[PDB]
């Protein structure tokens, strides 16, 4: 499963297994039993 | 349940502990000190001058 | 002068009821058979870890204590007073007389000369024991009033002290004093250390006896 989107530069630590935050508590969640990789790269030039 | 806990389709005569049992809480209650000093903001928000 | 407590300064260390049992605690107590100062009638004492404080009379010469680190302005302190009316707890920044007292006309209170920035108020022979302690911004006070059949000497016996007050102040304390009613028309000071005791509980739930477990090999 490739989940692809764009976020604010701050809550890149909000995509992680097990956490609390306004991005993680309302718009996207990962289980604490996560197994996979998370890749993030900057974008204001696109 | 006996057949499950004994892991067998045959059981022999006897008495067998199979599970536990317990009564569940019907509801919930809360107790706390009475009400006396709830702050009378009707002096600062209710002044004559 | 100095005197010897015998079994004195035991307080209920929690709110828990207990029927006929023997319960073991670790806390700050006044060790058995201790060396308690004697005062007659007074000066600035230390605090350093809680205080036992008894007193004896039929009149009322002991009229409360004053606490704190500097007993003046520039830092906060407590003040506990009793005129012939009733108790007056108070927490401001004060300016305390170096020899503060109250008279007995019956006009009095040369205690302080300043009451600034008050952060807490409150208004409303004999042997009168008190235990004062100060933990996590709370200033706890235990007390007991037993009747002696003497006038002003420290007796012998067992009597557990019941909690009175609780004040969420935050105040720092390093020193304390006393207040007396002058003449115009006896008290002791122990200190508390971390000990381990064995308290015997009655069937009504009162402490009737105790054992200090660091006195001797038998204990």
């Amino acid at each position: 499963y490739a989940d692809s989107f764009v976020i604010r530069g701050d809550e890149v630590r909000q995509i992680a297994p097990g956490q609390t935050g306004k991005i993680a508590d309302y718009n996207y969640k990962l289980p604490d039993d996560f197994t996979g990789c998370v890749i993030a790269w900057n974008s204001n030039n696109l | 349940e006996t057949k499950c806990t004994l892991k067998s389709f045959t059981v022999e005569k006897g008495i067998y502990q199979t599970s536990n049992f317990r009564v569940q809480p019907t509801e919930s209650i809360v107790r706390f000190p009475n009400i006396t000093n709830l702050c009378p903001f009707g002096e600062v928000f209710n002044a004559t001058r | 002068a100095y005197t010897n407590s015998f079994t004195r300064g035991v307080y209920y260390p929690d709110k828990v009821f207990r029927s006929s049992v023997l319960h073991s605690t670790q806390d700050l107590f006044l060790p058995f058979f201790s060396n308690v100062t004697w005062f007659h009638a007074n000066p600035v004492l230390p605090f350093n870890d809680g205080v036992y404080f008894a007193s004896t009379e039929k009149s009322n010469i002991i009229r409360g204590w004053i606490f704190g680190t500097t007993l003046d302005s520039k830092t906060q302190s407590l003040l506990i007073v009793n005129n012939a009316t009733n108790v007056v707890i108070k927490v401001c920044e004060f300016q305390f007389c170096n020899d503060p007292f109250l008279g007995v006309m019956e006009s009095e209170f040369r205690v302080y000369s300043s009451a600034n920035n008050c952060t807490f108020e409150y208004v409303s022979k004999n042997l009168r024991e008190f235990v004062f302690k100060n933990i996590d911004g709370y200033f706890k006070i235990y007390s007991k009033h037993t009747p002696i059949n003497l006038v002003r000497d420290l007796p012998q016996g067992f009597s557990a002290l019941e909690p009175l007050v609780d004040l969420p102040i935050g105040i720092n304390i390093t020193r304390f004093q006393t207040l007396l009613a002058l003449h115009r028309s006896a008290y002791y000071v122990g200190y508390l250390q971390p000990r381990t005791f064995l308290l015997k509980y009655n069937e009504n739930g009162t402490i009737t006896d105790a054992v200090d477990c660091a006195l001797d090999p038998l204990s």
């Binding site: 297994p17 097990g18 956490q19 609390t20 604490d32 | - | -």
Partner: protein, 46 residues
């Protein structure tokens, strides 16, 4: 009527062991408290 120590000792040993078993339900073993309703009230599931 005025000696049964061998019978008293086996009663005492069993009671002393059953009490030690219950008195262990109030040790932390290196945790924040001894109550599960206190770790389930000031900590998130992870």
């Amino acid at each position: 009527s005025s000696a049964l120590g061998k019978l008293q000792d086996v009663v005492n040993q069993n009671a002393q062991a059953l009490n030690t078993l219950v008195k262990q339900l109030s040790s932390n073993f290196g945790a924040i408290s001894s109550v599960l309703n206190d770790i389930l009230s000031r900590l998130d599931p992870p």
